[PDB]
Amino acid sequence: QQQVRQSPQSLTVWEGETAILNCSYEDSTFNYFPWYQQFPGEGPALLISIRSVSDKKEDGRFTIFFNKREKKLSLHITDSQPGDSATYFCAASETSGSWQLIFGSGTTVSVSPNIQNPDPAVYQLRDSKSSDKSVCLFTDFDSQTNVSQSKDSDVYITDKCVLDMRSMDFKSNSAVAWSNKSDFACANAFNNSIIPEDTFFPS
Amino acid sequence: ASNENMETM
Amino acid sequence: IQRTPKIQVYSRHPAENGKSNFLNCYVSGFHPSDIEVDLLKNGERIEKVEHSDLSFSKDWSFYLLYYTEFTPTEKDEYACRVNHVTLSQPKIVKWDRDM
Amino acid sequence: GPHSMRYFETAVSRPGLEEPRYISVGYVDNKEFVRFDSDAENPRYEPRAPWMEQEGPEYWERETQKAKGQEQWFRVSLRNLLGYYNQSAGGSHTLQQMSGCDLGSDWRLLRGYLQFAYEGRDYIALNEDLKTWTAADMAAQITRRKWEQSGAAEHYKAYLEGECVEWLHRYLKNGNATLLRTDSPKAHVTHHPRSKGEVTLRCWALGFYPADITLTWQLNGEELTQDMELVETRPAGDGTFQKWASVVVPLGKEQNYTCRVYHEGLPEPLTLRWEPP
Amino acid sequence: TVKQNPRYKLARVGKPVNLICSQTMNHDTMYWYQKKPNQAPKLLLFYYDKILNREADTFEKFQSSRPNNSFCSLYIGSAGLEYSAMYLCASSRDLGRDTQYFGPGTRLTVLEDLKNVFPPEVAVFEPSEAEISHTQKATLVCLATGFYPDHVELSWWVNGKEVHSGVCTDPQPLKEQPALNDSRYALSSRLRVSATFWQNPRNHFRCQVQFYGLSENDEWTQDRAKPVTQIVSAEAWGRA
């Protein structure tokens, strides 16, 4: 239609790999194409833009490749970092209404960090006696591993999240699972999730 | 003296 | 709908050979505002042509007057050439001292 | 007697350009006093009357800021009109405005005016009450719905009843010597030879202000119409107007035909006929 | 530099909603957008200097006022479930191609009743003994449970100062009972530090959760404590 189409809806790229973020339009009247980047709890900010007259614009790692004939443009992040993991919006503007920006659906990029020495393990955190729930932690696993939800409704489990320890230049993935039920244990906590076979379980 | 219009069409 | 201009070629004062006057070309009742007006002397364009700035009537139709300083003579022929989107080619209206 | 102040605004969209051509023309007693043009080297309000030079530079800067704001109002409105009528920006579109007030003989507000037009056709117009709106097309009803919710009519009423009247009062006091003038027409009948035993008598009317005039040709006290060839009232250039009325009559009975001119600032309608030299 | 407060707004159906936006940059244009999940930010209306322009497909739903260049507000007459979206405010120094500086935004959820509003239950969990033995690190897990709506802001505090280093928090909170609607939410946070840092009793660890719910002028009739905009925290020092 007379809108701005953005593909893919979500993209998962490894640290260092080149991430291609496509954007297509139908109206030939569009001549200005800016890209906006928004982080969680923050509004979109101008990253890099391009005009109809230019076919390529580079700003460090970020590069926009534009094709006026095919009416398509793409954003390239040659050296992907976990700090780039944000939502990207492709806007289009015409001379008629230069003040207005027609944004695309968006692309949620997720740069998976490279783990130098992976040590997958499931640990049990001791209760603070204030709560009846026991907390289980699956940490230091590779980004290839996917965390799945528990079959039991009473057992709550959170998805894979990354932390950065700059002072030690170390990054690690973590997953939290908890339940107040007595039959719940750390060994049978992440049973539904396809966890590595070399996962460390303490005796 | 001329007048300034408020809301647009 | 677009409106065709109303052309009138005349002099400021009654035409008298040897006596100085002003040749006027009044184009009114046209829409849109875009118009091409040129005053002619024996088929040739006049360089010293002045015009009144764009104005529109109560019925939203545009109007402007094109004037030049001239000395009328029995031999010389004057006319006004106007062009609008409502026309197919520029319209040339001859100047009559009796009208 | 009666007075009036108007502001004839125009906005012609230019394809391939961001801003349109905005021309605001101010009038006092159907005569130009202020003018703005975006096409000008330095776009700002300029006086078109010698008595208007009395205003300080503070006033011109205040009015230029109004026009610069209006230039953008018409720019966004022109884009909104494209969406309503489903048109293209690649074509030229005109948007015109007629706003002001007309005062009575007692220097009091008689009526308030606010009229809009798109493509030379009536779009939206503020009613005599200055509270309700008149919408022609279904597109103009969207504008009416928007302006009724934001209360645009209330803001226009405040100017039309207040500021528009307040400023006109001081404009009349600044140049009453040249504003109140009614130039009486100079009439003369000219002889012209025509086909066979027929002649054309052209009754001329020159040097009159305002343009509102009437030319009549009659035989035995009976007005002649659909046979009398008249011309549209045309400006001379110096600030006065011209008009003529011709009729094909037989030679010999030409003295029976009489011409009458009806114009304001004349004690009684001028009656005249052809004089043989 | 564009400011938007509060970050989260809670309103009842029919009641009027008013969102303010500050810029303090002397910008001529100030835009208002509507952002729905996995959808493009739709332009609602904008204010150039003192001139207002509302989009033809949304003018009936939204109104706007601008007293001064710095402040521009978005007004909603009668609130309804269809308005439940984020409202982003942008500002530009011109009415053209120049950069649009967006604010942090305001997440608005409008419901039939304010009965299901609950404050969070924050509890810190001391790192695993096996984690300190196997790896040179220790992970602290914070747990916020039984809160409604989704409106929460988690923060980690070490020795009185806020830290972002080794902090991992879920982007969206998990549903306690996802099978049925009008369900309470749960959020988890992770704080990874060195083994020596946790074993030291001098070091202090605190988990702060900024809850957004009812206001000072909000209606309440129930016997249960008012779920007003409050701060719930959990403390832990360490074990040698």
- Domain map (residue ranges) of chain C: 1-99
Closest CA to A94 of A29, A152, A150, A11: A29
Say yes or no: A1 and A88 in one domain. yes
Chains with 3+ CB–CB pairs under 8 A to D are A, B, C, E
Say yes or no: A136 and A173 in one domain. yes
Say yes or no: D27 and D153 in one domain. yes
Say yes or no: A7 and A26 in one domain. yes
Give the domain range for residue A121: 114-201
* D251: in domain: yes
* D277: in domain: no
Q: What are phi and psi of E97, to 5 degrees?
A: -70, -20
Experimental method: X-ray
- CA–CA dist C85, D20 (Å, integer): 20
**How far does Cα A48 stand from its chain's mean position?**
20
> What are the structure tokens assigned to D277, written together?
């030299």
Cα dihedral sign, E93-E97-E103-E106: positive
- Parallel, antiparallel, or unpaired for β E106-111 and E8-12? parallel
Say yes or no: E74 and E139 in one domain. no
- CA–CA dist D17, E98 (Å, integer): 16
CB contact under 8 A, E53 and B8: yes
Q: Which of B3, B7, B9 sits opposite D159 (nearest CB)?
A: B3
For residue E175, what are the β-bridge partners?
A: E185
**How far does Cα D168 stand from its chain's mean position?**
17
Say yes or no: A109 and A119 in one domain. no
Interface test with D, best of C12, C34, C60, C67 (most D CBs within 10 A): C60
Say yes or no: E172 and E213 in one domain. yes
Say yes or no: D54 and D147 in one domain. yes
* Domains of chain E: total: 2
Show the CA angle centred on residue D113, arms to residues D123 and C31, nearest 5°: 45
* Residue E59 C-alpha, separation from nearest chain D C-alpha, in angstroms: 7
Say yes or no: A135 and A43 in one domain. no
Give the domain range for residue D9: 1-181
Chain C contact for D96, CB < 8 A?
yes
Say yes or no: A128 and A197 in one domain. yes
Say yes or no: E134 and E219 in one domain. yes
CB contact under 8 A, C60 and D117: yes
Show the CA angle centred on residue D257, arms to residues D256 and D259, nearest 5°: 135
Say yes or no: D137 and D202 in one domain. no
Starting at the edge strand found earlier in the chain, the sheet holding D222-223 runs D222-223, D213-219, D258-263, D270-272
| Contact call for residues B1 and D33 (beta carbons, < 8 A) | no
Considering A97, A113, A129, which residue would you say is the last residue of a domain? Answer: A113
Other Cβ atoms closer than 10 A to E70? 16
Say yes or no: A197 and A122 in one domain. yes
- CA–CA dist D71, D24 (Å, integer): 9
- Parallel, antiparallel, or unpaired for β C50-51 and C62-70? antiparallel
Cα dihedral sign, E160-A165-A42-E68: positive
Helix, strand, or coil (residue D218): strand
Closest CA to E89 of E150, E135, E43, E141: E43
Considering D181, D213, D247, which residue would you say is the last residue of a domain? Answer: D181
Helices D138-150 & D57-85, crossing angle to 10 degrees?
Answer: 130
- CA–CA dist A190, A203 (Å, integer): 17
- CA–CA dist D29, D6 (Å, integer): 8
Which chain E residues are closer than 8 Å to D80 by Cβ?
Answer: 53, 56
Say yes or no: E43 and E68 in one domain. yes
Closest CA to A114 of A144, A137, A138: A144
**How far does Cα E44 stand from its chain's mean position?**
22
* Residue C42 C-alpha, separation from nearest chain D C-alpha, in angstroms: 23
* Domains of chain D: total: 2
Say yes or no: E14 and E102 in one domain. yes
DSSP letters for E143-174: EEEEEBSS-EEEEEEETTEEE-TTEEE-SSPE
- CA–CA dist A203, C12 (Å, integer): 114
**Contact call for B and D: 3+ CB–CB distances under 8 Å:** yes
Q: What are phi and psi of D25, to 5 degrees?
A: -115, 120
Say yes or no: E30 and E65 in one domain. yes
Say yes or no: D207 and D169 in one domain. no
Cβ neighbors of A66 (< 8 A, separation 6 or more) are A33, A50, A52, A54, A55, A56, A57, A73
CB contact under 8 A, D89 and A98: no
| Contact call for residues A5 and A104 (beta carbons, < 8 A) | yes
Considering E82, E112, E142, which residue would you say is the last residue of a domain? Answer: E112
Among all chains, which residue has been given the structure tokens 């007595």?
Answer: A182
Say yes or no: E29 and E146 in one domain. no
Cα R_g (chain E), whole angstroms: 22
Q: Which of A29, A95, A97 sits opposite D17 (nearest CB)?
A: A95
Which chain D residues are closer than 8 Å to E95 by Cβ?
Answer: 72, 75-76
Annotate E91-110 with b (16+ C-beta within 10 A) or e (fewer): bbeebbbeebbbbbbbbbbb
Give the domain range for residue E212: 113-240
Considering A113, A145, A168, which residue would you say is the last residue of a domain? Answer: A113
Say yes or no: D77 and D142 in one domain. yes
Residue of E nearest to D78 (CA): E53
Helix, strand, or coil (residue A193): coil
Residue D57 DSSP code: H
Say yes or no: A109 and A186 in one domain. no
- CA–CA dist A115, A57 (Å, integer): 32
Which chain A residues are closer than 8 Å to D17 by Cβ?
Answer: 95
> What are the structure tokens assigned to D122, written together?
């009536």
Show the CA angle centred on residue A185, arms to residues A183 and A186, nearest 5°: 170
Chain A contact for D82, CB < 8 A?
yes
> What are the structure tokens assigned to D151, written together?
């209360």
Interface test with A, best of D72, D79, D81, D87 (most A CBs within 10 A): D79
Reported resolution in A? 3.0
Cα R_g (chain A), whole angstroms: 22
Say yes or no: E202 and E184 in one domain. yes
CB contact under 8 A, B8 and E52: yes
Chain A contact for D89, CB < 8 A?
yes
For residue D25, what are the β-bridge partners?
A: D8, D35
* Residue E54 C-alpha, separation from nearest chain D C-alpha, in angstroms: 8
- CA–CA dist D80, D139 (Å, integer): 10
Say yes or no: E123 and E231 in one domain. yes
Closest CA to E91 of D137, A199, A101: A101
Say yes or no: E237 and E118 in one domain. yes
Distances (CA, A) of D118 to D11, D35, D77, D140: 10, 21, 10, 10
Say yes or no: D192 and D139 in one domain. no
- CA–CA dist E88, E105 (Å, integer): 4
- CA–CA dist C65, C86 (Å, integer): 19
